[PDB]
Amino acid sequence: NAKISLQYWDGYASYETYLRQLSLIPGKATDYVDYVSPNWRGSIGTDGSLKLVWDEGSSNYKQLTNMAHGLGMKVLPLINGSGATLNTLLKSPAAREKLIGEIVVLLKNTNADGVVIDFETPLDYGDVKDPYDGVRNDLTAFMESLHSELQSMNKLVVMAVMPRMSSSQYWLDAYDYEALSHAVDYLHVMTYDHHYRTSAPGPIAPYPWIKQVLTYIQGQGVDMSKVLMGIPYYGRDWVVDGKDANGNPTYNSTAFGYSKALELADSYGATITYSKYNDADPVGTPTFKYTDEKGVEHTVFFDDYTSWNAKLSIINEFGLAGVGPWAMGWVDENTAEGLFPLLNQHLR
Ligand SMILES: [Ca+2]
Ligand SMILES: [Ca+2]
Ligand SMILES: [Ca+2]
Ligand SMILES: [Ca+2]
Ligand SMILES: [Cl-]
Numbered sequence: 001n002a003k004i005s006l007q008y009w010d011g012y013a014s015y016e017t018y019l020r021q022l023s024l025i026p027g028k029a030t031d032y033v034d035y036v037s038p039n040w041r042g043s044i045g046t047d048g049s050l051k052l053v054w055d056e057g058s059s060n061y062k063q064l065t066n067m068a069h070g071l072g073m074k075v076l077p078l079i080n081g082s083g084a085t086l087n088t089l090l091k092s093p094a095a096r097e098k099l100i101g102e103i104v105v106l107l108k109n110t111n112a113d114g115v116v117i118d119f120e121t122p123l124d125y126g127d128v129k130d131p132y133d134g135v136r137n138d139l140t141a142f143m144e145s146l147h148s149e150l151q152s153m154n155k156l157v158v159m160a161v162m163p164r165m166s167s168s169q170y171w172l173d174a175y176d177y178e179a180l181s182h183a184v185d186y187l188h189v190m191t192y193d194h195h196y197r198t199s200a201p202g203p204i205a206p207y208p209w210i211k212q213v214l215t216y217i218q219g220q221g222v223d224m225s226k227v228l229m230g231i232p233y234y235g236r237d238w239v240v241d242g243k244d245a246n247g248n249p250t251y252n253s254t255a256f257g258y259s260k261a262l263e264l265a266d267s268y269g270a271t272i273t274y275s276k277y278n279d280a281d282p283v284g285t286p287t288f289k290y291t292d293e294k295g296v297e298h299t300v301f302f303d304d305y306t307s308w309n310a311k312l313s314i315i316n317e318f319g320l321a322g323v324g325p326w327a328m329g330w331v332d333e334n335t336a337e338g339l340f341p342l343l344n345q346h347l348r
Contacts, residue, residue, distance in 0.1 A: 003315060003320070003346065004034050004186065004323075005033045005322055006228055006323070006324035007035065007037070007325065008036075008328060009328060010327040013054070021331075022036075024331060025336070025340065028072070030073065032340045034073070035156075035158075036068050036073050036076070037078045039077075040077050042054075044079075044081045047094075047095050048095030048096060049099075061106075065112050069111075075110070076112065076113060076114045076116045077112055079117055081118070081120070082119065082122060090142055093141075096145060097145070100145055107153065114157055114158065115155070116158040118160040121171065123135050123139070125170055125172075125173045131173050136173060136176055140176050144183045146183070156186075158185060158228075158324075159184045159188065160190055160324070161187065161189060163192075164213065164217065178220050185226070186321055189213060189229060191210040191230040192326065195236070197252065198250065200251060201300075204235065204236060205303075206281065207285075210230075210311060211317070214314065228321050228323055231326075232303060232325070232326060233257060233258070233303070233327060233331055233335075234256060234257060235256060235302020236255050238252070238299045239296055240252075258304060261286075264288075264300065265288045268290035271288060272286050273287055275287045283307055284310075285301060287300060313346070315347075322347055
């Protein structure tokens with residue numbers, strides 16, 4: 001009954017932030033977390049070169065990894081990219097070789113346990129009709145070359161992919177989900193940010209929407225026992241920040257953790273309500289509104305222990321491998337007290 005707990009270690013360029021996040025994991029560490037994924041990515045180049053967040057010969061990477069290893073966890077450095085820079089790279093077979101080589105020397109000069117690839121949209125999808133042109137096959141070739149290489153080193157490969165809902169979403173055609181699922185050990189479907197920073201307010205990851213995404217992914221024929229679902233630790237506070245050139249109201253928002261949301265609702269005396277996404281949403285997502293001292297109306301959507309628990313149940317419905325939440329930086333001591341036991345109940 002043991003499921004995979006992949007935690008994202010978003011310390012960015014701050015060595016102390018990495019340490020502070022580990023220290024926020026209580027009891028026996030392996031009872032809550034299997035893998036930790038640090039975003040040690042500084043910049044990825046056209047030619048496939050890789051630049052990390054600190055100086056060249058820094059001992060930070062080795063020290064942080066031995067730290068996590070001492071706690072019984074495994075480390076999978078997050079390699080994330082997007083946009084034009086990543087499109088040129090994958091197009092070039094030399095640049096693909098180059099990046100993989102940089103990954104190889106990283107896992108050697110760190111003794112890490114593998115890598116989480118996070119190549120996000122925008123990605124070249126070419127013509128809309130043709131579902132097979134663009135960077136799609138070049139991306140697959142990268143994953144297959146990486147998988148072949150790292151598995152020789154007895155290292156793990158996890159790939160974070162965009163949450164596709166249906167066939168009409170042509171801009172996601174870069175992800176050959178079936179072929180990709182065979183080039184990884186785990187497939188992390190990032191089922192969150194259904195509502196984002198400048199969109200209309202709403203649940204960041206509604207219960208029926210996650211199931212909807214996973215149903216599509218299942219339809220592509222991927223092995224669901226290799227799929228890690230996604231869940232947000234953060235919420236969002238939306239306001240109307242103005243107008244566009246055509247007079248249309250524009251939204252903007254700030255992201256925060258579970259604790260901040262509670263303090264907010266308490267400060268303004270707003271009552272929290274579970275927003276049911278539709279008739280197929282039993283528990284729902286917590287939400288509230290308030291008006292600040294400047295007269296601006298705010299709308300908040302976030303996740304508590306109640307909604308988190310309902311969404312984690314999807315692991316049992318689809319027989320998933322586990323969950324990859326984003327991210328530990330959104331968890332403070334108050335949140336951690338109830339969140340980690342909650343994780344242990346579902347991930348055992
Ligand atoms: Ca992301
Ligand atoms: Ca296309
Ligand atoms: Ca199509
Ligand atoms: Ca208008
Ligand atoms: Cl943001």
